[PDB]
Design a protein around this motif. Structure first.
Motif, PDB file in Angstrom:
ATOM      1  N   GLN A 181      -3.508  -8.780   8.897  1.00  0.00           N
ATOM      2  CA  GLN A 181      -4.284  -9.412   7.896  1.00  0.00           C
ATOM      3  C   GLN A 181      -5.677  -9.712   8.364  1.00  0.00           C
ATOM      4  O   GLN A 181      -5.888  -9.795   9.585  1.00  0.00           O
ATOM      5  N   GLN A 197     -15.048  -7.532   5.885  1.00  0.00           N
ATOM      6  CA  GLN A 197     -15.058  -8.368   4.679  1.00  0.00           C
ATOM      7  C   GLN A 197     -16.460  -8.925   4.396  1.00  0.00           C
ATOM      8  O   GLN A 197     -17.314  -9.011   5.307  1.00  0.00           O
ATOM      9  N   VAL A 244      -4.267  -4.500   6.380  1.00  0.00           N
ATOM     10  CA  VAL A 244      -4.492  -3.132   6.696  1.00  0.00           C
ATOM     11  C   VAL A 244      -3.212  -2.640   7.394  1.00  0.00           C
ATOM     12  O   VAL A 244      -2.609  -3.407   8.184  1.00  0.00           O
ATOM     13  N   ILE A 256     -13.222  -1.908   9.017  1.00  0.00           N
ATOM     14  CA  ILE A 256     -12.827  -2.538   7.745  1.00  0.00           C
ATOM     15  C   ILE A 256     -13.408  -3.960   7.751  1.00  0.00           C
ATOM     16  O   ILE A 256     -12.988  -4.799   8.589  1.00  0.00           O
ATOM     17  N   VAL A 258     -14.408  -0.216   3.588  1.00  0.00           N
ATOM     18  CA  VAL A 258     -13.920   0.594   4.657  1.00  0.00           C
ATOM     19  C   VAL A 258     -15.047   1.566   4.982  1.00  0.00           C
ATOM     20  O   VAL A 258     -15.634   2.222   4.050  1.00  0.00           O
ATOM     21  N   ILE A 289      -4.477   5.223   8.325  1.00  0.00           N
ATOM     22  CA  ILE A 289      -4.742   3.838   7.859  1.00  0.00           C
ATOM     23  C   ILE A 289      -4.500   3.661   6.322  1.00  0.00           C
ATOM     24  O   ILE A 289      -4.909   4.502   5.528  1.00  0.00           O
ATOM     25  N   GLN A 290      -3.892   2.583   5.893  1.00  0.00           N
ATOM     26  CA  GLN A 290      -3.811   2.308   4.449  1.00  0.00           C
ATOM     27  C   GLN A 290      -4.405   0.964   4.164  1.00  0.00           C
ATOM     28  O   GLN A 290      -4.137  -0.056   4.904  1.00  0.00           O
ATOM     29  N   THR A 291      -5.202   0.913   3.095  1.00  0.00           N
ATOM     30  CA  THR A 291      -5.635  -0.363   2.620  1.00  0.00           C
ATOM     31  C   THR A 291      -5.430  -0.384   1.148  1.00  0.00           C
ATOM     32  O   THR A 291      -5.080   0.613   0.539  1.00  0.00           O
ATOM     33  N   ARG A 292      -5.838  -1.474   0.534  1.00  0.00           N
ATOM     34  CA  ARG A 292      -5.863  -1.522  -0.919  1.00  0.00           C
ATOM     35  C   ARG A 292      -6.711  -0.397  -1.585  1.00  0.00           C
ATOM     36  O   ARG A 292      -6.528  -0.058  -2.752  1.00  0.00           O
ATOM     37  N   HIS A 293      -7.681   0.119  -0.825  1.00  0.00           N
ATOM     38  CA  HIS A 293      -8.608   1.180  -1.355  1.00  0.00           C
ATOM     39  C   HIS A 293      -8.106   2.538  -1.021  1.00  0.00           C
ATOM     40  O   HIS A 293      -8.684   3.405  -1.507  1.00  0.00           O
ATOM     41  N   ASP A 326      -5.765 -10.234   2.273  1.00  0.00           N
ATOM     42  CA  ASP A 326      -5.415  -8.821   2.333  1.00  0.00           C
ATOM     43  C   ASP A 326      -5.080  -8.328   3.719  1.00  0.00           C
ATOM     44  O   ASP A 326      -5.402  -9.009   4.678  1.00  0.00           O
ATOM     45  N   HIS A 376       0.831  -1.241   0.000  1.00  0.00           N
ATOM     46  CA  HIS A 376       0.000   0.000   0.000  1.00  0.00           C
ATOM     47  C   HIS A 376       0.819   1.224   0.000  1.00  0.00           C
ATOM     48  O   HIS A 376       0.291   2.276  -0.114  1.00  0.00           O
TER      49      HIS A 376
END
Ligand SMILES: N[C@@H](Cc1c[nH]c2ccccc12)C(=O)O
Ligand SMILES: N[C@@H](Cc1c[nH]c2ccccc12)C(=O)O
Ligand SMILES: N[C@@H](Cc1c[nH]c2ccccc12)C(=O)O
Ligand SMILES: N[C@@H](Cc1c[nH]c2ccccc12)C(=O)O
Ligand SMILES: N[C@@H](Cc1c[nH]c2ccccc12)C(=O)O
Ligand SMILES: N[C@@H](Cc1c[nH]c2ccccc12)C(=O)O
Ligand SMILES: N[C@@H](Cc1c[nH]c2ccccc12)C(=O)O
Ligand SMILES: N[C@@H](Cc1c[nH]c2ccccc12)C(=O)O
Ligand SMILES: N[C@@H](Cc1c[nH]c2ccccc12)C(=O)O
Ligand SMILES: N[C@@H](Cc1c[nH]c2ccccc12)C(=O)O
Ligand SMILES: N[C@@H](Cc1c[nH]c2ccccc12)C(=O)O
Lengths: 68, 69, 68, 68, 68, 67, 69, 68, 69, 69, 68
Positions: free
Chosen positions: F41, H41, F4, H39, H5, F57-61, F2, E61
């Motif tokens: 994860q 799923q 975070v 967050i 998110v 915070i970082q995620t794939r989005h 995935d 990321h």
């Protein structure tokens, strides 16, 4: 599974399939007349393909040109 | 499976497949003359490929050029 | 499975396979003279590769150059 | 699996593999002299890699530099 | 499987593996001194990682920095 | 699977894991002090993650910030 | 599995399937007249395709043209 | 599995999981206070997620905001 | 999870012809489209090649192409 | 691992309707959203088509579309 | 598995599912009124979809419009 496109730029272009396996020799030769196109995969029996003669070739890695 | 493209830039270029496994040796040397193109995969039997002679090479990582002795 | 491209920039460059497994030792050293190109996969037997001598190297992460 | 490229920028750089598993310890230390390049996978035996000494490193995540 | 790259920007940085499973606790803490790099996977045993101390971190990321 | 990235921007940040499965409750709360980073994860036991406290915070989005 | 698109630019274009396997032969020739389009996969039975006649061809590697006879 | 998110922009936001299967009903509501982030799923148990109250939401298809 | 083609008829009576997968090749179905209708058709267990006759705008993963009547 | 759709109600009484997967097609559930609520809904073993009625802002992997009441 | 988005631009737009299998016929017609949206997958029972009427359509290959 990957494939190559071969366009013959003159008569008698030779697309040569080499046998997959511990041994290497050619198992088929497909000749193309000028302007014909062959689109051929890597397969259970073919793991290398040689082109002889003037051809315009496309693969996943871009254009290449064989010269006779 | 990946493949490499090799176009011979002079006569007598050799594309050499090296055996897959604990043993490493040449099992086949394919001779290319000027102008011919070989498109060769990695396989059950070939896990490294050596090119001797002047050739123009494409792989997934881009173009590279072998130079002959 | 990935591979690395090695072009030798002088004579006697060595492309060295290190054994996959609990043990790490050499196993094979392929000598490249100037201008030769080796394109070598990671394999059941090889999980690390060392280059010694001056060579131009391409991997999926880009170009890098070893120095003798 | 993913691999890392490490180019030693000085003598006696150590590329150290940490064991995969419940236990974490060094199983192997590969010494690179100045200018050598090690291309090293993550593997059944190695789930973390530590670099000690000045080196230029590439991973899928881009460049980073370890310092002496 | 994903990995994280950590470059220690000061001495005594701790890269701490947290256990995978119903239980969460620290099973290992790797100490990095200044300029050392650790490239560390998620694994069967490690499903979260914590960095404490000043470090430069790369993941899929992007870049982030921990502070002491 | 995935993950975070969480960076604590102040002391006392909680990264809380929520149980996978038919039922939903907190099974772990990891405390982060200022400047500590956790990379976490999704797993067999954790199918949702709650962040409380100020963090980057970082995620794939992409990036988001809790307060 | 990959496919190729072939649009005939004149009458009587042939799209020819070559057999997969150890034996290689033509097993089918699909005639296209001008303006018709065939979109054809590689298959358990076809591992190479030849086009003869003037046609506009699209593959995943881009546009190619076959030139007639 | 994909995840969403949700950042709550006011107190009392509800993130509601809907049951997977032939039956559709709410099985859980997670309450978020202003500035909390969840967050979450998709799972064996949760095939749709509803958000009520003011929040900034990110998914693979971009940003969307819910309003109370 | 196969690929699919988009066919928009630009006139009445366009034919979208499915060809049989397998060792034998024949038309197993012709779906007739009138002007302005759109068919979105996959490759399948039964269809490994698709022929379009008549005037149509076509989209596939390799781009746009047009058949002519 | 399936695809999903985001639906934001732009007025009260928006219905997100799930159509049954399989040989039988019917509505099996209708989710009511009031203004400003969001539903993120997957395709599932039970739901192979989703109908939106009422004014809503929708995001799929193909982009934005809007339904109008 | 792929899906098609259909937005009715007038009343009575008909989204028609064709049977997967050796036989081809319609097995379901879902009518849409102006401004309703249908997001429909390809499935075990539907391997081709026909749209009749004025509609705005998105697929992975872009936008297309049917005319009624
Ligand atoms: N029979 C060989 C053919 C081959 C493929 N790639 C090669 C590279 C070099 C030499 C021979 C080959 C094999 O399957 O491995
Ligand atoms: N037989 C060796 C061939 C090889 C591939 N990659 C290498 C890198 C270095 C040295 C040898 C190799 C193996 O399969 O592992
Ligand atoms: N035998 C070791 C070789 C290895 C690969 N990557 C490494 C990184 C560091 C040290 C050793 C290695 C292994 O298979 O794991
Ligand atoms: N033995 C540990 C090694 C490890 C990998 N990543 C880590 C992160 C932090 C601490 C230890 C590790 C494992 O396989 O999980
Ligand atoms: N033992 C936990 C560790 C963990 C991973 N991600 C988390 C997020 C929050 C809390 C705990 C965790 C697990 O494998 O699930
Ligand atoms: N136990 C729930 C947790 C959960 C995941 N995602 C959610 C979304 C909304 C509410 C609860 C959840 C599950 O595994 O499904
Ligand atoms: N029955 C043939 C149909 C076909 C597909 N692609 C082709 C290319 C050329 C000729 C025939 C075909 C097959 O499944 O293989
Ligand atoms: N029967 C050969 C047909 C073929 C595919 N690609 C080729 C390349 C060259 C020569 C023949 C072929 C095979 O399936 O392997
Ligand atoms: N029953 C046909 C439906 C079909 C899919 N794509 C087609 C293309 C042309 C004609 C019919 C079709 C099949 O499953 O194969
Ligand atoms: N129980 C339904 C829930 C659902 C998911 N996506 C939907 C779309 C519309 C209506 C209901 C749903 C299912 O698992 O299929
Ligand atoms: N029960 C049908 C629903 C469906 C999905 N996509 C469609 C397209 C048109 C008509 C019906 C459908 C199916 O699972 O196949």
């Amino acid at each position: 599974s990957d494939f190559v496109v071969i366009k013959a730029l003159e008569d008698g272009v030779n697309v040569i399939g080499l046998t997959r396996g511990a041994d290497t020799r050619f198992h088929h030769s497909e000749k193309l007349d000028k302007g014909e196109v062959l689109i051929a995969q890597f397969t259970e029996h073919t793991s290398a393909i040689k082109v002889r003669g003037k051809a315009y070739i496309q693969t996943r890695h871009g254009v290449i040109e064989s010269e006779g």
